[PDB]
Amino acid sequence: SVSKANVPKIDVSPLFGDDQAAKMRVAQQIDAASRDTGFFYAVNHGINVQRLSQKTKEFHMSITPEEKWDLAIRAYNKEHQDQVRAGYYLSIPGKKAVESFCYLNPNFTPDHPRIQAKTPTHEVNVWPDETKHPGFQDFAEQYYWDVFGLSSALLKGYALALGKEENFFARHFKPDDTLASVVLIRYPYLDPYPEAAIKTAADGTKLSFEWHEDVSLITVLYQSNVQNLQVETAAGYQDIEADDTGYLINCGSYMAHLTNNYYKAPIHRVKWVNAERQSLPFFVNLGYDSVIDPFDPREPNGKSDREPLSYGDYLQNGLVSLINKNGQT
Ligand SMILES: CO[C@@H](C)[C@@H](NC(=O)[C@H](CS)NC(=O)CCC[C@H](N)C(=O)O)C(=O)O
Ligand SMILES: [Fe+3]
Numbered sequence: 001s002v003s004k005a006n007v008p009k010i011d012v013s014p015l016f017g018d019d020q021a022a023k024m025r026v027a028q029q030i031d032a033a034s035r036d037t038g039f040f041y042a043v044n045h046g047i048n049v050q051r052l053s054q055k056t057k058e059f060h061m062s063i064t065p066e067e068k069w070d071l072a073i074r075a076y077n078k079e080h081q082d083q084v085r086a087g088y089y090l091s092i093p094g095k096k097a098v099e100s101f102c103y104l105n106p107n108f109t110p111d112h113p114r115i116q117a118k119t120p121t122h123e124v125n126v127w128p129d130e131t132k133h134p135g136f137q138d139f140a141e142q143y144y145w146d147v148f149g150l151s152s153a154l155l156k157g158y159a160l161a162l163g164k165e166e167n168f169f170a171r172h173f174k175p176d177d178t179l180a181s182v183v184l185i186r187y188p189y190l191d192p193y194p195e196a197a198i199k200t201a202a203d204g205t206k207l208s209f210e211w212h213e214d215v216s217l218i219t220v221l222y223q224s225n226v227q228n229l230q231v232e233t234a235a236g237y238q239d240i241e242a243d244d245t246g247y248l249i250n251c252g253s254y255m256a257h258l259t260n261n262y263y264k265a266p267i268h269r270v271k272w273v274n275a276e277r278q279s280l281p282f283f284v285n286l287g288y289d290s291v292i293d294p295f296d297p298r299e300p301n302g303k304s305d306r307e308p309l310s311y312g313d314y315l316q317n318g319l320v321s322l323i324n325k326n327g328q329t
Pocket of ligand 2: 212213214268
């Protein structure tokens with residue numbers, strides 16, 4: 001009834017090493033995948049995803065309602081005016097099923113110059129009490145760095161794929177200032193599952209989250225082995241198979257901008273599934289003042305009629321618009 005999307009499995013291990021020819025062969029596969037459905041699985045990525053899953057499960061299943069208010073973002077807790085991005089996003093039983101915890105760069109500390117300046121989109125992370133969640137903060141911060149590593153390698157692949165030197169994106173993706181986020185999303189099993197938490201697409205498909213493009217350079221996603229994603233193709237919406245051993249990778253609308261839509265931000269959506277599962281994105285965001293000059297890999301002189309857009313500008317307005325379009329998560 002719905003056809004399977006072409007989502008290749010790409011061994012990205014050469015992107016960590018020094019074999020330039022092998023790196024170019026990976027880059028070709030990323031180009032291919034980016035020009036086709038816009039999705040691929042990164043395999044041989046080196047990340048312990050089963051441990052991520054386990055640690056995340058321990059957290060979601062032990063956090064209490066009291067803790068969630070204490071950690072809640074501003075949209076749920078008016079007292080937490082600084083928490084626009086980082087913290088807990090509550091469920092609303094009977095209305096909204098999904099809940100999550102988002103955290104930013106661990107280097108956004110109280111002394112960070114961007115935190116001092118109160119620059120939008122920079123926040124100091126909030127964490128649960130260590131005795132209630134032993135090891136969690138340390139685990140999560142280390143995870144950030146492990147997926148940051150993977151991400152840097154991927155960005156070397158995308159840069160090569162676009163005819164650039166391998167540090168073309170990665171030079172703007174830096175430990176000290178990246179706006180990248182981790183979200184630890186819980187999609188619950190509910191019996192009965194409230195109809196109010198289920199959206200219906202124009203084509204009749206039951207959804208948890210409507211069609212959209214990502215607010216990211218690239219999105220680096222772990223999920224449970226429960227099929228849920230669809231991508232819009234010329235042949236209609238197609239199902240993206242689950243693979244809980246790989247990371248699902250796609251471009252966001254910043255990459256679209258930079259490449260003049262050579263690498264499109266694929267339009268996708270999340271089907272409603274009544275299952276207890278995890279969706280753990282890392283949104284690969286650059287620095288607040290990062291600007292890459294837009295170019296066009298299909299044009300002889302490489303020139304584009306797109307204007308430079310700073311990442312911070314892109315991100316703050318992106319995140320607002322996505323809430324407007326698709327609802328407060
Ligand atoms: C596969 O979809 C994934 C990534 C997940 N969806 C999302 O995470 C959605 C749409 S990409 N993203 C968002 O809602 C943006 C969140 C940004 C975050 N609060 C930040 O401050 O950086 C899900 O709904 O399971
Ligand atoms: Fe998305």
